[PDB]
């Protein structure tokens, strides 16, 4: 642990299944920050997962979670609820598309994929968004991810778009919903972090190496750029901030054509 | 008729309920320029519903189609590749939510809804557009219609406001895939059009920068901007047709609050 | 003469100094509609230069106008009083900014360029609108030209990007002052038309959705909504006329990099 | 002092005039995180304005600047550079327009307004970008503040919507020139705060009140809020954000009409 920003504060993190991803990345700053955390893992066959990566961070409590299973999350509410008595803060790390559609044309998606796609992707963060309400009786701050493919078209997303479009502007609606009892609703634009040494995915390494030599850094996006930002809206820092998505993506977002 | 913008353009409009509806003033716009459309209407039973305002459009083919259903979708258009052979213009008007979900709060959705709002005000659109896709020979244009509650909170627009958000980005990489074939698409983001529905149009009208609400004619005219030759060079846009009212950042201090 | 949607509106179109102008592809289709225009030139030094281009569009008045010049700007709106009475629409096409600052790094930047771009390429617009408005008493539609550079860096576009983001608000805020006229104020945010120059139009053409480059005749179309009465009903937007840059985040994966 | 977070970072805050405006909240909250400060006054006669609250900071080096002036500007990085070597941020929280004008109509605005507020309030932060620039060779951050009406019409603003909508185009150019270097250049768009008991203005009660009811906080922007977000995007944890416009509105940007 290396400072006290979120010292006092407990909160659900949703989505870490490895220590390369960008929900881990957000574990470890808050972690090290003091934060009190709970980890989710899809079911008991990832638990062995799961343990050592909260092991290390320091983490006691680990519960079931699948953001598609109503009853899944409900009862993982409960369980906080039964832990804690009150929650601080919610990350919303959970992304799901069906990825031989991502190969091809965004206008031949079907309609499963992207009625599946919706609903991990966007509606479930509504969802976790109502329960997590009666438990943040002393404001609080609620975090999803997002990316560039929400604003602009890139290459490899297709409907994963169309599902962040919809979750930014799902973030705006609840910011107004939550905002009277002081919870934040806000999301983090992450521009492309690597996170597997072989994608085997041409278009990723294209996505990658494109964002290193045109963002205004001229670099990547790394982990604790990620989790810095995830402090400062998860953290007292934060507590104008709501219904925003902030871009942690060293600046790509404000390239028109290429660096030069 | 009253003009040629549109001769010699076949296209098919999507969602003429009546002739207060976003699609009609469109079809009225474009029949007036001198396309050639089709109407659809939900189902035979729905079907005495379309036929006046096909009637007085001088619509001459209309055919039954139900958004949610990819075999209807399928059908239809084989029926205007065997009528027609190709095809210029796609206008999409069609929107569904749960009326009782929008009067509550937007944090209290549920999944059922989410996804049957996103599946006929949303995918639908993208759908539609594969099956149009391979009619579209000569190019052409496929147009959607969008509501600032895309962009801003607007109250008990809820679900609506996330799927129309969902809609303006499919535009955006449907736009990328159609383009290869010269095929534009655009979305206009409505103002209200002259309870709930009335103080939102009360509250447009004094805010807009132009002090009225947007009309029928409005819409039909930025519809025949993005489907006749006059906007080849426009794709992916979501053009404002809302006297203004996208650029205002808070209420007129010269308008009353109500 | 091709169409009528411009019958009977007279307006004055500013920047025609060539045949490649936007302001020449707006005049050229604004005058294919019927519309009655006047041009304005610079100098008498350099009327020599607009008198052809006022002939083959068949403008009968063109009147002489510095638009960094606030009496220039008064005596050309004297003189289209005088002559007309009245106005229908005014294209302000107009931008200047120090070539070799361009070809340097933004923050590098002098004051003195910074003033004079900021003056020439967005309060100009202002200043006319200003001066149009005791004219533009049936309404009417005031229009400029803008760039992706306003939302995005395009690199070697450094001030003029600062300039035209400028000139994209002021589009706002003048729409709100001339609305209660029912004057619209729009912009076009145009692609570059078909070394820094080439390299950008060669960009756009690989990435942009529909693949080819912007033409005049595209940005006459977009004008032709926004000043004609089928755009009477949107104020205060920038309609991108880009053949759909404007939604691509990223170099396509099928075009080279140059 | 309260943290750390500032702690050896080195900086200069250009605009506290008074312990009521925004640059003051931002001088205040990274002085409390351990930074090391060098405030700004416009001359000789406002040193006796400005030395009570760099003694109230634990400021010690305080410098005449006129924004206006770029040989004033100069001086005083001159002194910033003979005093300390390097820089590690720079706030420019500096505005001028004719208040004369802010009460008409924008479309009735005049030339040497807009030319000096285009000077001052936009202007002036490239050409201090550009003499930070050199003295920052660890990287660093330069943030300026907006105002939504930058995006918006909003009520006796005029010119300066138009001003701050080029300010937030600079730092996106801004950004990609500096980046390379590892500097960010960002700015907060803040909510409005209530800086007079009585400015004798009506709109600006409406505005005020107007963002205070209709906003999802249902509160003002605070001197704090902008305080925190400058923390992070000045401190390390915002490393990863560049070319970015943050809203630290209580929420106001999300809002299309009015709370219900």
Same mark, same amino acid.
């Given at each position: 642990?290396?400072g006290?920003?979120?010292?006092?504060?407990?909160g659900?993190?949703?989505?870490?299944?490895? $220590?390369?991803? *960008?929900?881990?990345?957000? @574990?470890?700053?808050?972690?090290?920050? =003091? @934060?009190?955390?709970?980890? %989710?893992?899809?079911?008991?066959?990832?638990?062995?997962?799961?343990? #050592?990566?909260?092991?290390? *961070?320091?983490?006691?409590?680990?519960?079931?979670?699948?953001? &598609? $299973?109503?009853?899944?999350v409900?009862?993982?509410?409960?369980?906080?609820?039964?832990?804690?008595?009150?929650? +601080?803060?919610v990350? !919303?790390?959970?992304?799901?598309? $069906?990825?031989?559609?991502?190969?091809?044309?965004?206008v $031949?998606? &079907?309609?499963?994929?992207?009625? %599946?796609?919706?609903?991990?992707?966007?509606?479930?963060? %509504?969802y976790? @968004?109502?329960?997590?309400? #009666?438990?943040?009786?002393? =404001?609080?701050?609620?975090?999803?991810l997002?990316?560039? =493919?929400?604003?602009?078209?890139?290459?490899?997303?297709?409907?994963?778009?169309?599902?962040?479009?919809?979750?930014?502007?799902?973030?705006?609606?609840? /910011?107004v919903?939550?905002?009277?009892?002081?919870?934040?609703?806000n999301?983090?634009? /992450?521009?492309?972090?690597?996170?597997?040494?072989?994608? =085997?995915?041409?278009?990723? !390494?294209?996505?990658?190496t494109?964002?290193?030599?045109?963002? #205004?850094?001229?670099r990547?996006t790394?982990? +604790?750029?990620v989790?810095?930002? @995830? *402090?400062?809206?998860?953290?007292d820092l934060?507590?104008? %901030?709501?219904?925003?998505?902030?871009?942690?993506?060293?600046?790509? !977002?404000?390239?028109?054509?290429?660096?030069?």
């Amino acid at each position: 642990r290396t400072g006290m920003l979120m010292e006092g504060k407990k909160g659900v993190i949703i989505g870490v299944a490895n $220590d390369k991803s *960008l929900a881990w990345g957000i @574990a470890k700053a808050v972690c090290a920050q =003091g @934060a009190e955390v709970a980890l %989710t893992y899809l079911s008991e066959t990832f638990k062995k997962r799961v343990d #050592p990566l909260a092991e290390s *961070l320091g983490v006691k409590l680990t519960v079931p979670c699948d953001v &598609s $299973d109503a009853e899944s999350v409900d009862n993982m509410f409960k369980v906080l609820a039964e832990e804690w008595g009150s929650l +601080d803060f919610v990350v !919303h790390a959970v992304a799901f598309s $069906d990825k031989n559609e991502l190969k091809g044309r965004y206008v $031949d998606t &079907s309609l499963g994929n992207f009625l %599946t796609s919706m609903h991990i992707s966007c509606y479930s963060f %509504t969802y976790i @968004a109502s329960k997590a309400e #009666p438990l943040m009786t002393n =404001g609080g701050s609620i975090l999803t991810l997002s990316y560039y =493919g929400a604003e602009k078209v890139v290459p490899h997303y297709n409907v994963m778009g169309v599902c962040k479009a919809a979750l930014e502007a799902s973030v705006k609606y609840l /910011a107004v919903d939550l905002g009277k009892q002081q919870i934040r609703v806000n999301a983090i634009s /992450a521009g492309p972090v690597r996170t597997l040494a072989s994608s =085997g995915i041409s278009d990723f !390494h294209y996505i990658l190496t494109w964002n290193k030599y045109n963002s #205004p850094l001229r670099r990547n996006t790394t982990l +604790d750029d990620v989790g810095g930002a @995830a *402090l400062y809206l998860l953290s007292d820092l934060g507590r104008g %901030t709501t219904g925003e998505t902030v871009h942690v993506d060293c600046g790509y !977002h404000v390239v028109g054509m290429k660096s030069v």
